[PDB]
From a paper:
[name] is located in the [name] intermembrane space and is a member of the conserved [name]/PRELI protein family, which is associated with [name] function. [name] is another conserved yeast intermembrane space protein belonging to the twin Cx9C protein family. As the binding partner of the Ups proteins, [name] facilitates their [name] import and protects them against proteolysis. The role of the [name]/[name] complex in lipid transfer was first reported in 2012; thereafter, [name] was recognized as a lipid transfer protein mediating PA shuttling between [name] membranes.
Author numbering:
A (entry chain B): 0 to 61, 74 to 114, 116 to 166
B (entry chain A): 6 to 33, 40 to 74
């Protein structure tokens, strides 16, 4: 269904270790009052030496929504990739966020984020408008044909 | 940081602190005991919340 993608870049003036640990310890903070809980579903060191983690968040808004967060930390390359998406209300809207953190020229951690918003109601509106147009078409065709018969009658 | 099940929150903190040490110092699986405690609590809570409503609804009979 309807898909939209936006991209942004932010540079943290800190080491990759500090930024990564902070990502894993983000809540609670005064700038994110909507997060209600975080839970670590899985965490291991993969065959390539990269830390794979899957965490589970819950959030409020204007009413509560579950969110999955997948993350890979390559310590050899000092890189990190994060992805997040809601698990419920997926038929209404799906918000996916993909961010890459990399580390020395500026001695900073660059985070390139890209969010994909995909709403599925674009077809749910079309289906109801389709039934509506079918009904209106039947009614109008019947009325027009009956008027034509009436005027043949004269 | 809370947990979706409050009874697990303290075990979650006990895993999170150990994993923070492990990550900050060693990695940049020694916390397996607190990990077992936390994952057991979380598995029990997931079982409860996600499964039991169906069973308690299906338990509706002359006992
Ligand atoms: C379905 C919506 C997808 C969930 C989602 O990712 O929204 C992110 C926002 C803000 O989350 P941050 O990106 O961490 O700022 O949370 C909500 O307010 C949702 C409340 C829900 C009302």
């Amino acid at each position: 269904p309807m898909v939209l993608l936006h991209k942004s870049t932010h540079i943290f003036p800190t080491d990759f270790a500090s930024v990564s640990r902070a990502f894993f310890n983000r809540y609670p903070n005064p700038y994110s009052p909507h997060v209600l809980s975080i839970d670590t579903i899985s965490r291991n060191v993969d065959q390539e030496g990269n830390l794979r983690t899957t965490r589970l968040l819950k959030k409020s808004g204007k009413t509560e929504t579950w969110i999955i967060e997948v993350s890979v930390v390559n310590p050899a390359n000092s890189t990190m990739k994060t992805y997040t998406r809601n698990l419920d209300h997926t038929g209404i809207m799906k918000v996916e966020e993909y961010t890459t953190y990399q580390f020395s020229a500026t001695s900073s951690t660059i985070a390139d984020s890209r969010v994909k918003f995909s709403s599925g109601f674009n077809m749910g509106i079309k289906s109801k408008v389709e039934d509506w147009s079918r009904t209106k078409f039947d009614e109008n065709v019947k009325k027009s044909r009956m008027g034509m018969a009436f005027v043949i009658q004269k | 940081s809370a947990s979706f099940a409050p009874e697990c929150t303290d075990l979650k903190t006990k895993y999170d602190s150990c994993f923070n040490e492990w990550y900050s110092e060693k990695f940049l699986n020694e916390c397996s005991k607190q990990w077992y405690a936390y994952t057991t609590c979380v598995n029990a809570a997931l079982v409860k919340q996600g499964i039991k409503p169906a069973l308690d609804e299906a338990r509706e009979e002359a006992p």
